[PDB]
Amino acid sequence: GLPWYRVHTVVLNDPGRLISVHLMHTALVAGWAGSMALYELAIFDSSDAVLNPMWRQGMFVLPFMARLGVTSSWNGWSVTGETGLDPGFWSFEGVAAAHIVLSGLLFLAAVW
Amino acid sequence: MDRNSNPNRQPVELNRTSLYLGLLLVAVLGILFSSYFFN
Amino acid sequence: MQVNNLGFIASILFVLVPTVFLLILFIQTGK
């Protein structure tokens, strides 16, 4: 049979299942993004952006949301040191939940 | 002494339904006992 | 929370060991 290191070559000539495995990989990556953001949010210390900013807290995906304009939480705080801002749905939590739901939908499409 | 094939050997089977049942049982046992393991 | 320090490893193994037992048996079935 196939050696272990060749198992995935079964989709080499199967465009439908190649799309399927690409969908599953995309779902996994999007789910990682969502869950990583959720974890970082669950442990982020927002009180002191001066001497305890995100890069002192091992925050890996949070800076990437903030780079493109997602800088506030639903929970009231913003990584710019401010409070009481209203980001709308597109807060850190909103973005992470978006990635989770996307992961699910991609999973379902992969199954199909 | 010689090494003779043992004729008492039999295949083992676990069907897919049994797999799902066992996996659910293990998952629900874990759900139940994890809180006590953490205490 | 100050939980039992063996809690995570005990929970992971409690689930994983029978999970892999079942997985092995299922996958090899029909051999």
């Binding site: 669950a42 | 897919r16 339904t17 799902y20 996996l23 659910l24 998952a27 874990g30 | 929970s11």
Partner: peptide, 30 residues
């Protein structure tokens, strides 16, 4: 961090449900 363990076991149970439904052994008449 024990919350992660609880979420993991709950997710495992739910995933098992989804596969047991979607990917079940068909009942076949023969």
């Amino acid at each position: 961090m024990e919350s992660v363990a609880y979420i993991l076991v709950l997710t495992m149970a739910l995933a098992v449900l989804f596969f047991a439904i979607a990917f079940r052994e068909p009942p076949r008449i023969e």
